[PDB]
Design a protein around this ligand. Structure first.
Ligand SMILES: [Ca+2]
Ligand SMILES: [Ca+2]
Ligand SMILES: [Ca+2]
Lengths: 351, 351, 353
């Protein structure tokens, strides 16, 4: 059918109560041999109501954390202290594997939506979270040690340790909270494409130290209803495209082991499509839309356009060769390619 | 029967007409578990008659392109222009994934033979080519986009787009013809040169294009009757491609206490043998011969000789220890090892 | 049941005679899908009696070589000459793939015990040895070439080649020595121990501090504990540690997460026994006797050890009162108090109360 399309319903709920939820996308390679280059990566969605705290835990994986909606306070605990960060909409930050952290939605009215990208290394494709808190879904990891180990460790009788640290709590890992390097914004630089129809912002590993270690680019797409992101392809980056707001009509063109395949889907909020490198892709805004792209294998990526005035590789083929490439003449090919005056994003209204 | 040997007949014909052919070697790991270290690599052979053009296309893979015979004009298309390169025999150049390119045989009389080495990353072991031109085998990938997407993109009626770009013009991708440049395998002094043979070798340490791929390229020329004496590579696995003449290869592997096996084959034009790192190998020229070696995992490769005067590791074992290593005496081992006065290449005539 | 535990009996004997032995641990991923991150690595143990020589051979793999007991002379053969190294107890060195070498136990009285860590690249998970010497288990690899190839190569009649290089002389690849006189090794204990109190010491060499370890992305540590001492619950952020019991008996408790579900892996380790400690998994270790252990940490770059008990480097103590109160069933005050009870750091008295 479409091995590149992941609907909101292909997410497993890890935890949910009335205060928020943690969801985990199935392995990219669960249902297809075609995405073995994504086997090390998992996607998570965290959603929390006003005045909520995700209790402290470390992941066995590196995390890229992105605020899709609202605002957050992120605390990273280290062996000798802690670092406290305010995250606004569009703010991203890397959490190093094995750093205990907790996440607060400090807003009194607006929900918090966070996209988490996991880069796994201990057990490729597997993400584990170690929660200090004992809850219905799992006891504290501390509880797995023997009585003698715990008593000697904390120099305290087991009874005190058990009542003070271990006993299974009444809420889960998201609770209501009293008072009832650095983050970087996806839009911290000038957009790389910008006209009356759309904008794309892009942060690359070349320009960002946190993204450099992961070999990842992040982009942020805004388009007006009826705008069309024209046919183009990425030379190196495979892009995990996340629908944030609005509805996107995607056409993806692939070669499969033999056959030429069209992949066409309308994506609503939460929906994900993978755009493999070299595969031509185009995207029409059915409503005003915001989308986030995560590009893996990002180093030295180059975007090649197949329509419009600027960065159109077809326009760069000389008349002599275009004449032999296409049924038209060099003159007819050149003329047709000049008809589109816009670049990158155009009017997608039919005629 | 020799999992390292790939005869010309283990190539699939991807495309062939009266103007030329493109052939693709089976996956190194198709028929053996012994070459998992080569799973990311594929070999292609392109042959074209005089005054031919391979039509513009991009690959999803990095390409090392090497002219085995003749001359080529190579055009690399970028979003803002194009680079044109003359390739002579022995000239190699890396084509970055997603770079549209076309290949002309400008010669009036001599064929063009090209060796293409594919380094895959999107789908390991799979190489895809995206041809702009519609042909009998497959329509243009542009044709896979919807009518509304194409009309909006090119700001032109579908009729004109279809007649100018999309209709099947050529029957095949080979037709009649009306930053950082190629390097020749012999642009440096050969590393071994005597009356019997020469080896030229370009390493990733000395070539910016090879550095990113961790690959070395070597070029072997021997006179009929010359013998390339037993040696092994510490790190590089060498894909050895017979170009001209007939090569008698002896490869020694430790493959089921382990069973010790000789893999002996005579290689003729197109035939490939893989020489795993650490495996002793020798080659006798049955006729005058030329061969090309592609060495992967090339960084810090060191070639250890088991015979001859220079770079002979056995000669470096002191008498006391060689006396315990070999049935001879230290003196008898030292004396025997001094009998061969030549280095690297010797007279291979039967006693 | 415990997929992280490798008893001395999960080693295959590659070679053994009266002079010593070479043993090879089963693939980390032979019996479990949980150790895919260790697929490229193998562990070997070489043991030799006094006055012994392991005959010249190259490996298809990179080798990290560590003297667990006694002393060695290591000779590396290069195309143009040779390098000779003295290795004492706690000395390690990397041997480059394809470098022929020989190993001597020069001591007259003490055995030589060496831990070999193989980093495979030719055939991931496979380590091969190429011996120049013909023995019962295998003829010389030189013998596998045709007569004509050998005669032309050595410019000698096959009879002299065969008598001088090829004939099976030695019974095995470990032989007695008549006379032992006829970037350099580094010691695990060359720096201050990073943890040291009255109960235990840990020494650690990291890729950040050692060029040989940097190219392999490996850290080595060396653990010494007194009977009754306890290495308190902690975890490694990035390094998966292959823990090798050298002397005495260790009681290990390892806590894993494969809903996913919570698992205790408890084992007592005797000499030779190995346990794998995956990164992020809390671990603790009690010395049943005086104990020495060696850790090989892979994926070592930027590893940080987080302690869950004791005063120093205790991540739990760095959670503010307000949040501790919400994290634990106790109150911020009761949590803070309890975490301050243990006055020691890293290693404590493990005696039951
Ligand atoms: Ca040849
Ligand atoms: Ca002898
Ligand atoms: Ca000794």
């Amino acid at each position: 059918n479409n091995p590149y399309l992941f609907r909101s319903n292909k997410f497993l709920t890890l935890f949910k109560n009335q205060h928020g939820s943690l969801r985990l996308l199935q392995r990219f390679n669960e249902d297809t041999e075609k995405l073995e280059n994504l086997r090390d990566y998992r996607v998570l969605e965290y959603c929390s109501k006003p005045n909520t705290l995700l209790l402290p835990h470390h992941s066995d994986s590196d995390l890229l954390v992105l605020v899709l909606e609202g605002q957050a306070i992120l605390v990273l605990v280290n062996p000798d202290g802690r670092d406290t960060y305010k995250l606004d909409q569009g703010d991203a930050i890397k959490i190093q594997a094995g750093t205990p952290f907790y996440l607060i939605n400090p807003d009194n009215n607006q929900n918090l939506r966070i996209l988490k990208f996991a880069i796994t290394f201990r057990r490729p494709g597997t993400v584990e979270d170690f929660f200090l808190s004992s809850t219905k879904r799992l006891p504290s990891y501390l509880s797995a040690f023997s009585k003698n180990f715990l008593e000697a460790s904390y120099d305290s009788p087991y009874d005190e340790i058990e009542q003070t640290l271990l006993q299974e709590e009444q809420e889960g890992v998201i609770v209501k909270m009293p008072k009832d390097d650095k983050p970087f914004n996806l839009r911290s630089r000038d957009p790389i494409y910008s006209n009356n129809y759309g904008k794309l912002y892009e942060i690359t590993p070349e320009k960002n130290s946190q993204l450099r270690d992961l070999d990842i680019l992040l982009n942020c797409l805004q388009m007006n209803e009826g705008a069309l992101f024209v046919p183009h392809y990425n030379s190196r980056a495979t892009v995990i495209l996340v629908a944030n707001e609005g509805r996107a009509e995607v056409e993806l063109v692939g070669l499969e082991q033999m056959q030429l395949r069209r992949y066409a889907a309308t994506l609503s909020e939460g929906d994900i499509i993978v755009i493999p490198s070299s595969f031509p892709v185009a995207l029409k805004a059915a409503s005003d839309l915001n989308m986030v792209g995560i590009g893996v294998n990002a180093e030295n990526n180059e975007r090649n356009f197949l329509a419009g005035h600027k960065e159109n590789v077809i326009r760069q083929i000389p008349r002599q060769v275009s004449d032999l490439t296409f049924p038209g003449s060099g003159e007819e090919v050149e003329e047709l390619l000049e008809n589109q005056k816009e670049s990158y994003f155009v009017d997608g209204q039919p005629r």
